[PDB]
Structure formats: C-alpha cells, structure tokens
C-alpha cells in the first residue's frame, strides 16, 4: 500500500494492532462488576484480578488468578462499565 489512511483507520485494524502500536494507545482491559446469587455484597473487580479476591465480608470466592484474565466461578453475572 502506497497510502494507508493512518489519520482515521477502521476500528477492526485498531483491535488488530497491538495495545501500544495503535494511533493512540489504549489498554485492552476493563473494569467490571460481579455479584453472587447466594449473597448480597457486591464488589467491582478488574479484568486481570492478579490474586484471589474475597467477597466483602468473607462470604465466597470470586476470582481465580491466572496468567491473563481472571476466571469467575459459575452462576455469577458480570457487566462492564464506562464513562
């Protein structure tokens, strides 16, 4: 390609490129919320939780730390959030 359009490329190319090789750098992680059906107390958990997170009040286990994204236990809903 003699001329790409690096002014405003397509967003599939922006997800195709690296997190730092993009036009403006932006992380590929997000902040998310999670609840347990057998309990109340709700916390907000990072997408790479990096450690075992406890329910706030010592009720249940929520995330298992892995190499990348943390794994949620079954029966727990999750949504992201944005501003």
């Amino acid at each position: 390609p003699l001329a790409k359009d690096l002014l405003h490329p397509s967003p599939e190319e922006e997800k195709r490129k690296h997190k730092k090789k993009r036009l403006v750098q932006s992380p590929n992680s997000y902040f998310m919320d999670v609840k347990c059906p057998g309990c109340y107390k709700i916390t907000t958990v990072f997408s790479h939780a990096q450690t075992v997170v406890l329910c706030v009040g010592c009720s249940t286990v929520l995330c298992q730390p892995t190499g990348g994204k943390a794994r949620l236990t079954e029966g727990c809903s999750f949504r992201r959030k944005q501003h």
Partner: protein, 149 residues
C-alpha cells in the same frame, strides 16, 4: 532491550488517554487515603497497595483521584521506610543467593547471577546516593546481611 538479559521485551502497562475520575465509583479522596494508611499499617509494599486497591476497591490510579501517589503520601505522614523497596528486595535476593552459594560451593551460574545482582545494586545505589535519599557513605557489604534484611 533488557539491561542484563539478551532478550528484548515489550510487555508493560499502557495508560489510556482519558484524564478523569470515572463516574461509576463515588469515593472521596480522604477515605481512600485512610485505606492506604490502614493497609500500610498492615505492613505492605506500595506496589502491593496499588494492586490491592485496583483489585478490590475499584480505583484505577491514585494520581487521578488524589493529587499525589502512594510514596508521596507515606513520606508526607511518615510510614515510608528509609530503605526503598526495590533496593530492599535486591538486598534480600543477594542475601538468599549468598546463603545458597554458602551451602553449595561448586556452582558457577549462581555466582554469575550474584555478580550481576551486585552490579545492579551498585548501579542503583549510585542513583540513590546522587538523589540524596540514602546517606552518602552507605556502602553495601556482602557480610552485612543481618543489618537490614
């Protein structure tokens, strides 16, 4: 590339462009700072403090929600130790490697890595001497293992 390794790595954090406190968390600065002083009184490293905050309490960075980072706060009230945490970890690694070599004589790779980490701690000690953090006459010695572990 790396300072003491042949490989080149490209894997680090990448902050977003947005300069704002997000609206989905409504947590004022002072109660957050109270959580830092409580977690520091529990006896933990500021890196672990930032990890625990962004894990459980949902805050992205301290620098956007307050005017200061963690070590500025712990220096402002005074719970920050005199030994910096990275140099403390390098000291503890040097003590562990030296004890391993003391109980295992015929070894060369461990000795080579010991020379590498002594070079690293010396090159960092020059920086902490010229930025007036450490005392100017403070010299690390291999035999001074039980002073600051």
């Amino acid at each position: 590339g790396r300072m003491h390794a042949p490989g080149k790595g490209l894997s680090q954090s990448a902050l977003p462009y947005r300069r704002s406190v997000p609206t989905w968390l409504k947590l004022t600065s002072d109660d957050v700072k109270e959580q830092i002083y409580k977690l520091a009184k529990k006896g933990l490293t500021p890196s672990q403090i930032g990890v625990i905050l962004r894990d459980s309490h949902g805050v992205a960075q301290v620098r956007f929600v307050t005017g200061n980072k963690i070590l500025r706060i712990l220096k402002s009230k005074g719970l920050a130790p005199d030994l910096p945490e990275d140099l403390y970890h390098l000291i503890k690694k040097a003590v562990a490697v030296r004890k391993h070599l003391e109980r295992n004589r015929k070894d060369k790779d461990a000795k080579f890595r010991l020379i590498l980490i002594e070079s690293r701690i010396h090159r960092l000690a020059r920086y902490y001497k010229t930025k007036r953090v450490l005392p100017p006459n403070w010299k690390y010695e291999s035999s001074t293992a039980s002073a600051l572990v």
